Amino acid sequence: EQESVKEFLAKAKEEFLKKWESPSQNTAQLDHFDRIKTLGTGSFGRVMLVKHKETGNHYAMKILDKQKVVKLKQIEHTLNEKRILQAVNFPFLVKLEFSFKDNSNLYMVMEYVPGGEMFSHLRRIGRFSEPHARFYAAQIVLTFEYLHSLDLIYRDLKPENLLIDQQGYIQVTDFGFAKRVKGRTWTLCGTPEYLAPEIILSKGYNKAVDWWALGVLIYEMAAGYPPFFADQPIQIYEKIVSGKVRFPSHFSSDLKDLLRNLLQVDLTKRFGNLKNGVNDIKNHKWFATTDWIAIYQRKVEAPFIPKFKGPGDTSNFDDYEEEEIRVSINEKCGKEFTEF
Ligand SMILES: NC(=O)c1ccccc1
Numbered sequence: 001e002q003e004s005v006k007e008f009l010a011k012a013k014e015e016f017l018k019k020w021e022s023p024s025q026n027t028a029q030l031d032h033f034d035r036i037k038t039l040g041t042g043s044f045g046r047v048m049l050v051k052h053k054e055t056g057n058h059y060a061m062k063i064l065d066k067q068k069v070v071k072l073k074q075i076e077h078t079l080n081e082k083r084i085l086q087a088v089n090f091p092f093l094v095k096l097e098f099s100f101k102d103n104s105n106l107y108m109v110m111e112y113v114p115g116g117e118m119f120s121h122l123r124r125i126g127r128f129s130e131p132h133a134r135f136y137a138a139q140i141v142l143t144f145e146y147l148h149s150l151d152l153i154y155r156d157l158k159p160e161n162l163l164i165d166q167q168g169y170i171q172v173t174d175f176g177f178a179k180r181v182k183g184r185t186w187t188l189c190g191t192p193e194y195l196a197p198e199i200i201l202s203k204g205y206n207k208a209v210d211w212w213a214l215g216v217l218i219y220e221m222a223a224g225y226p227p228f229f230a231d232q233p234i235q236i237y238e239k240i241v242s243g244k245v246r247f248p249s250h251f252s253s254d255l256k257d258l259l260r261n262l263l264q265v266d267l268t269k270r271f272g273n274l275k276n277g278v279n280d281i282k283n284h285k286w287f288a289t290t291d292w293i294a295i296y297q298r299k300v301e302a303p304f305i306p307k308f309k310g311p312g313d314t315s316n317f318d319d320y321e322e323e324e325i326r327v328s329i330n331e332k333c334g335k336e337f338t339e340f
C-alpha cells in the first residue's frame with residue numbers, strides 16, 4: 001500500500017485509541033432538547049428528531065430503555081455502540097454529538113441526516129444502476145477499510161442503516177452490533193438476509209462477515225432485492241450456506257465476478273479476507289472507474305440528492321405512533337450501565 005495510505009490509517013488509529021481509552025460521558029441532558037417527531041422504532045428503543053433549545057440545531061436522538069436492553073441481553077452491545085461511536089471519525093460515519101443517561105434510558109444524540117435511509121430510495125426507484133450502486137459501494141469499502149484497521153467489525157450492513165446526506169453521500173448509522181475485536185468473535189447478531197455463513201454456523205468469525213454483507217448489499221442495490229430471501233429465517237439460512245446464488249441477466253460480468261468473490265461461502269477465500277485485504281476489492285475490474293481519493297474527499301458528483309426542504313424536514317422518514325418517553329423517579333440498572 002502507498003505510504004500515504006499507511007500514514008493516514010496510522011493517524012486514524014492513534015486518534016481513535018485516544019478517545020477509546022478515555023470516552024466522553026454525560027455531555028448533555030434531555031431538557032436541553034425539544035422533541036419533534038419519531039423517526040424510527042425498535043424492540044428496545046426509538047430514534048427521535050429533536051431540536052437543541054439554545055442553538056436551534058436539529059439532531060437525531062437514539063433512546064434506549066435500560067430495562068429492555070438488559071432483558072434482551074444487549075448490555076455489552078449498547079456499551080460497544082456508544083464507546084465506538086464517540087471514538088470514530090470518518091466522512092461516511094454519522095457523528096455522535098452528545099451522549100448521556102438518566103434513571104430510565106440511554107441517549108445518543110447524533111447529526112440528523114434529513115435525506116432518509118437508502119432503503120426507502122432503493123424501494124422507490126426499484127434498483128440502482130451499476131454506477132449508482134458502485135458510488136455507494138465505494139464508500140462502504142473505504143468505511144470498512146477504516147473500521148477494520150481500528151480492529152472494529154460493523155456487523156449490521158443493510159440499506160436501512162445507510163442514510164443519504166445533503167450531498168448524496170452515505171452516512172452509516174446504527175453501531176448497535178459494532179465491536180472492537182482482535183481475532184475472532186462469536187455473538188449471533190446482525191440481520192438474517194445479511195448474515196455470513198460462519199455466523200449462521202456458530203463459528204468464531206472475523207471482519208470477513210462485513211465483506212460478505214457488502215456482497216449482499218451490492219447485489220440488493222443492483223437487483224432491487226437481496227440474493228437470499230425467504231418467508232422463514234431458517235429458509236434464508238439454508239440458502240446462505242448452500243453456496244448458490246442466481247444473478248439477474250442485466251448484471252455485468254464484472255459485477256457477477258465481484259459478487260462471487262464477496263459471497264464466497266469459504267471465509268478463507270473471500271475477498272477482503274485474503275493476504276491483499278481490501279485491495280483485492282479496490283482493484284477489481286468492477287471498480288476500475290472509481291477514483292478512491294475523490295470519493296473520500298466527496299468530490300464526485302452524486303447520482304442523486306434527496307429532496308428535502310431543510311434541516312428539520314422529516315418527509316424522507318415515515319410515520320410512527322408518538323409514544324411517551326418516561327423517566328422513572330428511581331434509577332434502573334445503574335450498575336450495568338456505569339461506563340455509559
Ligand atoms: N421531554 C423532553 O425533554 C424530550 C426531548 C427530546 C426527546 C424526548 C423528550
Ligand SMILES: NC(=O)c1ccccc1
Binds near residue numbers: 060112114163
Ligand atoms: N442520524 C439520523 O438522522 C438517524 C435517523 C433515523 C434513524 C437513525 C439515525
